[PDB]
Design an enzyme around this catalytic site. Structure first.
Site, mmCIF file in Angstrom:
data_model
loop_
_atom_site.group_PDB
_atom_site.id
_atom_site.type_symbol
_atom_site.label_atom_id
_atom_site.label_comp_id
_atom_site.label_asym_id
_atom_site.label_seq_id
_atom_site.Cartn_x
_atom_site.Cartn_y
_atom_site.Cartn_z
ATOM 1 N N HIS A 41 -22.175 -3.073 14.324
ATOM 2 C CA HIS A 41 -20.992 -3.406 13.533
ATOM 3 C C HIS A 41 -19.684 -3.175 14.297
ATOM 4 O O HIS A 41 -18.605 -3.349 13.708
ATOM 5 C CB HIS A 41 -20.992 -2.636 12.208
ATOM 6 C CG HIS A 41 -20.781 -1.160 12.347
ATOM 7 N ND1 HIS A 41 -19.567 -0.607 12.694
ATOM 8 C CD2 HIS A 41 -21.624 -0.120 12.148
ATOM 9 C CE1 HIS A 41 -19.678 0.709 12.725
ATOM 10 N NE2 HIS A 41 -20.915 1.030 12.395
ATOM 11 N N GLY A 143 -13.993 6.279 12.904
ATOM 12 C CA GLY A 143 -14.133 6.282 14.343
ATOM 13 C C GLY A 143 -15.305 7.086 14.868
ATOM 14 O O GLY A 143 -15.591 7.023 16.070
ATOM 15 N N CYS A 145 -18.442 6.604 14.271
ATOM 16 C CA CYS A 145 -19.652 5.813 14.445
ATOM 17 C C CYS A 145 -20.048 5.759 15.916
ATOM 18 O O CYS A 145 -19.202 5.730 16.811
ATOM 19 C CB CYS A 145 -19.460 4.400 13.894
ATOM 20 S SG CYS A 145 -18.959 4.351 12.156
#
Lengths: 306, 306
Positions: A41, A143, A145
């Protein structure tokens, strides 16, 4: 003596954290050999996350659309692929700080250390358990991820988790390093619910053993019980059923403490039925279930790593 | 979202851990520049620890009596000195992994990350607070002496703790990196007691702010209170008195949450007087006091480090 929720030393994992930016979205990536792994993503916009066709979205992307930065050096990307929910970007240089590593898919109830990062920079390290419902109760801000969870076996880093999403529940979901989510979760911003989160019974038992080892013996009762009657009590209190495999796993701590596993089960049953009456065990007023028997043995006899 | 007891990334500190052996005693040392710092009781026998004359004991020791090992490489020691309760061994090679560092003496109530090591090898990392009675509640087994506690400020490691002793209480004592003990403790195996361990009130307040930030608002009451009446309540429950300095330190979280500090104080007073009634706050059934306001701000907006 003493018992603390303790994470693995994180240096070997720090050496592999990079920053991956696609379009306007920046997250963390894991740079091993000549491959950077990151959540797919990263190719999504904020609007794309509501219903993403990842194949069509990735097709609009070329190698030069992915900016990979290690510290302040830039990596040239020579290929990209999508493995399940992970993006693999082949870079031109192999990480000179690559440790001996493995990709493993952990089981529910197992623990690992999370290195929370932002913009490819490590910010903190803490211990987590894969809940029976395949979520984790972490500390993840925007942030984060691409942050990874891992275990260390002397010299070998076993990566087991990559953080992809925070559910509207506030708990967190992610994949293994092959891109397969833990649990029934998908990487889109939709209504997703984790099921009933039961308590890892064998972990609570290991924690009670650790408490006995450290001098907290007040909960040791005059009763014993059966495995089936204990499970009778466990199902009422949302505890996962205890198996003979769990008893065998607890064997070593039972031999160290001289307390049979089923006597500890009776003590735990009395704790569940009558509460703690305002007392504490190992500094906690709740029953802790994020310590595996392996964690307890390691912290009660102190094994080290590279 | 989410709140977790989180330690600093430990790689820069891992790079400095060595093994110091004198006679039959082996512990951990901190290798910075061309100097290895370690507890001076490395020169003690098991019998010497009952009543040690460290000057006379060190006089029987020469440079070649100290074996310093980094991984499996051996350092040549060219001088030795005793600074308070620390031994400083000058070696022939400066650590190529020396980070930018500082020695700081922290204040009671401040927090730091401990890198628990054994035989010079890092084994785990966890967060600790210097209790008001100048002890820490850690996880330290035999051989852990010389393990260090530190803070990270982007690139700079501020070392603040070196672990020297476990009291018969089970809690732990140590020095700063200049060798000065925290508290009234001495490095001999004798009856030593830490005083009353009060609760770090400003830390509990910061933790309540963190809870409010993360959606746990149930404890927010309809009352407010005065600083003096709050301290009246705090002294009964062994809470350290709250000062205007603490209110100013909590300022930013009060501005973020829209909750005045004294309203939070009234909520905390109701919690202290009536308990938690079997509820939890941030997954705990006790009031947590090992999060400074700095920790809360850092984990609720996610600052990173080198």
């Amino acid at each position: 003596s003493g018992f603390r929720k303790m994470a693995f030393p994180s240096g070997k994992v720090e050496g592999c954290m990079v920053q991956v930016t696609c379009g306007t979205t920046t997250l963390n990536g894991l740079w091993l050999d000549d491959v950077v792994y990151c959540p797919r993503h990263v190719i999504c916009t904020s609007e794309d996350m509501l219903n993403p066709n990842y194949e069509d979205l990735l097709i609009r992307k070329s190698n030069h659309n992915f900016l990979v930065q290690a510290g302040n050096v830039q990596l040239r990307v020579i290929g990209h692929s999508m493995q399940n929910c992970v993006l693999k970007l082949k870079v031109d240089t192999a990480n000179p700080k690559t440790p001996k590593y493995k990709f493993v898919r952990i089981q529910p109830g197992q623990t690992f250390s999370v290195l929370a990062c932002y913009n490819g920079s490590p910010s903190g390290v803490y211990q987590c358990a894969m809940r029976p419902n395949f979520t984790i109760k972490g500390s993840f801000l925007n942030g984060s991820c691409g942050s990874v969870g891992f275990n260390i076996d002397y010299d070998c880093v076993s990566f087991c988790y990559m953080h992809h999403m925070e559910l509207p529940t506030g708990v967190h979901a992610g994949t293994d390093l092959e891109g397969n989510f833990y649990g029934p979760f998908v990487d889109r911003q939709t209504a997703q619910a984790a099921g009933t989160d039961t308590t890892i019974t064998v972990n609570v038992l290991a924690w009670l053993y650790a408490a006995v080892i450290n001098g907290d013996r007040w909960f040791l009762n005059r009763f014993t019980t059966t495995l089936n009657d204990f499970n009778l009590v466990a199902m009422k209190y949302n505890y996962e059923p205890l198996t003979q495999d769990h008893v065998d796993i607890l064997g070593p701590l039972s031999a160290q403490t001289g307390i049979a596993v089923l006597d500890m089960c009776a003590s735990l049953k009395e704790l569940l039925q009558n509460g703690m009456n305002g007392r504490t065990i190992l500094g906690s007023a709740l029953l802790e279930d994020e310590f595996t028997p392996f964690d307890v043995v390691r912290q009660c006899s102190g094994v080290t790593f590279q």
